[PDB]
């Protein structure tokens with residue numbers, strides 16, 4: 001099904017291209033960081049117009065109207081009020097940087113495990129069965145394009161845990177025993193592909209009076225003419 | 227069967243900054259205007275914390291788009307799930323183990339208010355019951371697309387097949403496996419129903435959030451070098467140009483107390499993020515699948531896990 | 546509808562959103578139509594379709610250009626705020642323009658040989674300056690919750706969501 | 722919180738006034754101009770007079786909501802209010818509803834039935 005898988009991959013890349021070429025605002029997690037940093041800087045700039053109890057917020061018209069005996073009493077209030085705002089700004093930048101560092105470590109772990117290899121961790125490299133991933137650069141960020149396997153169009157069957165043929169139980173190597181109503185087949189677990197039950201895709205263990213739910217059938221022997 | 231407790235969220239508090247500093251006093255709210263934008267900073271920080279706490283609970287629990295139901299024929303090959311499945315006699319979605327867990331944790335205006343969560347306990351219980359019903363009736367297939375039904379004994383057989391043991395071991399020891407699982411669930415039920423207090427990690431969050439609010443209330447009885455800690459007594463005993471220098475000291479002390487509280491609330495929310503992200507990863511890799519990571523989902527070769535709700539937390543039952 | 550917005554200060558600013566607590570005429574307030582005895586609460590917005598007579602029973606006079614006060618100097622809108630200041634601009638429709646100041650320096654007033662009378666209230670606006678330094682828009686904060694949300698976020702467009710704006714409290718009714 | 726009357730010698734209690742908060746639920750200004758007002762935990766009887774009385778009054782566990790017609794449907798959540806109640810803008814007005822957690826599904830479990838997928842989709 002190589003051509004079908006190729007056309008589905010091309011259609012998915014085209015739909016990603018369309019949902020980005022439209023006006024769908026998707027980079028909100030990256031826009032939030034720029035907004036919060038700009039807002040913190042704007043608040044730190046607007047804190048320079050407060051007088052904090054003094055007679056003015058400008059240092060020049062305090063120095064050009066008072067003598068240094070009772071000018072330093074006015075200047076000390078502005079010094080304390082600006083030290084407090086600098087300390088608050090630096091503290092909250094230190095708290096934001098740890099969150100950015102945790103996100104960067106998560107991005108490095110995803111770059112190591114999704115792109116440089118195939119991952120078995122559920123919902124770590126996308127939703128479904130992960131195949132491969134591609135990186136794309138972004139302003140102060142990274143964008144991963146996870147390519148996953150999703151099953152579709154299921155169908156009901158009747159199942160059984162084992163098969164008793166000659167007084168012996170028979171278990172599958174890999175897969176399940178399914179039935180369409182009249183015949184019994186062994187198929188793999190994630191894609192319907194029925195096959196004849198022979199002695200090369202089953203193994204035998206014990207007798208057939210212990211397993212709860214065992215079903216009579218014929219297990220074919222492939223060395224029939226010899 | 228072991229038990230693993232993780233915190234998810236905490237209490238959403240808000241502060242009326244102007245009222246906490248000096249309520250019912252316009253000549254003090256005019257003196258708070260000489261400091262720029264402080265209360266807007268503090269309200270922005272606490273509002274971000276409050277939205278963050280709803281986002282934590284949403285990303286931990288809302289990991290299904292369907293709401294699955296357990297069938298009315300509970301013949302699961304011998305295993306018994308009635309202690310963790312929901313019970314209709316009670317007016318909630320809540321179950322017996324969840325009742326025990328909700329009864330163990332028992333601690334639970336100058337601007338200090340508490341905001342309610344977005345998801346309620348009944349909705350969180352509906353999420354966990356949908357997770358259990360999808361797990362028991364479909365295996366790991368409902369986390370990667372459409373829920374596909376399978377018998378529970380066959381599911382458990384090729385969950386044994388993923389730890390290096392063949393499936394004839396299960397099909398020849400099924401009754402013993404069922405009795406051991408039922409006895410393990412019974413021992414969990416007995417050790418939770420007894421007076422052993424195992425929800426210490428969830429009680430610590432409540433005690434640490436209570437002590438900070440009690441200190442923030444307690445700081446309103448300090449004079450900070452002024453003549454009184456009551457503002458109306460200063461306003462009734464002094465003329466305004468002599469009351470200025472006392473009200474300034476009270477404003478400075480109460481701003482210092484508010485800033486200390488908000489900084490420690492930010493640092494305390496920073497680790498609740500890490501615990502909620504760990505709980506979400508454990509949900510996705512323990513409940514929705516089978517994990518090969520050593521000592522991540524339990525202690526031993528991992529088979530399956532079940533989620534249970536808890537006050538501001540989550541409890542995993544690793545098999 | 547939207548009348549009585551002037552330049553509150555003498556400092557040039559441009560492209561900012563400045564918040565001024567000043568005595569303004571509230572938006573969508575009721576004004577008297579004349580085509581007499583007119584009291585003076587705190588300040589009067591005036592419009593027309595000659596001059597003015599002020600005072601209590603000294604007399605402040607403007608005729609038409611000579612002024613008797615003592616002081617002497619040698620579709621029309623007039624803001625008569627008293628700190629006596631006269632603002633004036635001419636070109637009540639639904640329009641809105643900023644009134645540029647003219648000149649600088651009472652319990653009733655009068656007029657000489659149709660007009661309107663407003664009354665200023667303690668308000669708090671949000672002016673929108675432009676590239677040329679003129680006012681093009683304003684927002685009264687205590688009109689409705691939408692404009693209070695616009696005064697809180699300090700913009701004229703609000704995004705979808707829920708916003709904490711203020712608090713409320715029933716006032717003490719009587720003393721004891 | 723308590724005090725003795727200095728003339729009748731009576732033990733009479735003290736409690737503060739109302740003290741709520743006000744939130745404003747709105748869509749964008751490029752969609753409408755109507756709002757709704759949430760009063761924080763005042764139970765709607767002790768409450769601008771159009772936003773104090775009238776029709777469209779609804780009682781929540783988060784407070785008193787004025788200006789939004791409560792319906793009996795259940796949608797995907799649009800604007801969160803609290804305790805399960807969301808709000809959205811829908812000839813056009815603002816509604817309030819209990820949010821839904823998803824659709825309804827019942828897996829057809831038995832002891833001998835399995836479902837095997839026959840096709841796939843690359844995503």
Ligand SMILES: *[C@@H]1O[C@H](CO)[C@@H](O[C@@H]2O[C@H](CO)[C@@H](O)[C@H](O)[C@H]2NC(C)=O)[C@H](O)[C@H]1NC(C)=O
Nearest residue numbers: 157178179180181182183184185186194195196
């Ligand atoms: C179940 O599958 C078997 C596969 O062999 C079907 O049997 C064949 O059906 C076709 C009909 O198109 C016949 O031409 C063949 O001769 C059948 N082969 C055998 C060995 O019987 C069977 O019809 C299927 N049953 C159902 C109910 O779908």
Ligand SMILES: *[C@@H]1O[C@H](CO)[C@@H](O[C@@H]2O[C@H](CO)[C@@H](O)[C@H](O)[C@H]2NC(C)=O)[C@H](O)[C@H]1NC(C)=O
Nearest residue numbers: 163164165166167168208209213214215216217
């Ligand atoms: C599966 O096949 C076996 C062998 O044919 C059946 O076992 C015997 O069947 C005969 C005739 O039906 C009985 O007389 C014997 O008593 C059976 N032996 C035992 C130990 O049960 C078996 O009944 C078949 N199973 C089903 C479900 O048909």
Ligand SMILES: *[C@@H]1O[C@H](CO)[C@@H](O[C@@H]2O[C@H](CO)[C@@H](O)[C@H](O)[C@H]2NC(C)=O)[C@H](O)[C@H]1NC(C)=O
Nearest residue numbers: 300301302304305306307308309322408412415
């Ligand atoms: C699963 O275990 C529960 C016990 O928790 C069983 O419930 C018992 O049910 C019987 C009647 O069927 C009652 O007389 C007992 O009192 C119940 N036990 C308790 C502790 O109340 C339940 O039957 C078990 N499930 C199955 C299928 O056997």
Ligand SMILES: *[C@@H]1O[C@H](CO)[C@@H](O[C@@H]2O[C@H](CO)[C@@H](O)[C@H](O)[C@H]2NC(C)=O)[C@H](O)[C@H]1NC(C)=O
Nearest residue numbers: 153154155156157827828829830831834835836
């Ligand atoms: C697989 O079989 C089940 C069992 O019949 C199907 O579920 C039924 O769906 C219909 C809807 O048309 C309901 O009326 C029945 O009540 C359902 N049965 C049960 C037991 O719930 C299911 O739709 C089938 N799925 C596929 C893909 O064929």
Ligand SMILES: *[C@@H]1O[C@H](CO)[C@@H](O[C@@H]2O[C@H](CO)[C@@H](O)[C@H](O)[C@H]2NC(C)=O)[C@H](O)[C@H]1NC(C)=O
Nearest residue numbers: 003004005007008011152153839840841842843
């Ligand atoms: C599996 O699903 C795909 C759809 O993704 C099917 O492919 C389509 O088949 C129809 C047949 O009528 C064609 O007209 C379409 O052009 C196909 N789509 C593409 C993208 O190639 C496919 O047939 C399905 N397979 C089975 C066995 O049902």
Ligand SMILES: *[C@@H]1O[C@H](CO)[C@@H](O)[C@H](O)[C@H]1NC(C)=O
Nearest residue numbers: 212213214299301831832833
């Ligand atoms: C499955 O359940 C049915 C009852 O609906 C019962 O008759 C049958 O024996 C059960 N099968 C197994 C293998 O237990």
Ligand SMILES: *[C@@H]1O[C@H](CO)[C@@H](O)[C@H](O)[C@H]1NC(C)=O
Nearest residue numbers: 674675676677678679680681
């Ligand atoms: C400013 O004035 C110039 C001409 O004087 C005009 O072209 C321009 O449009 C004006 N800008 C605004 C914002 O009014």
Ligand SMILES: *[C@@H]1O[C@H](CO)[C@@H](O)[C@H](O)[C@H]1NC(C)=O
Nearest residue numbers: 762763764765766767780781
């Ligand atoms: C709130 O109001 C409802 C009816 O309006 C009433 O039943 C209830 O007792 C009230 N609760 C309180 C705490 O006043």
Ligand SMILES: *[C@@H]1O[C@H](CO)[C@@H](O)[C@H](O)[C@H]1NC(C)=O
Nearest residue numbers: 789790791792793794816817
């Ligand atoms: C909603 O349902 C209740 C029944 O609990 C009913 O009384 C009420 O009239 C309904 N309202 C609407 C708008 O359908």
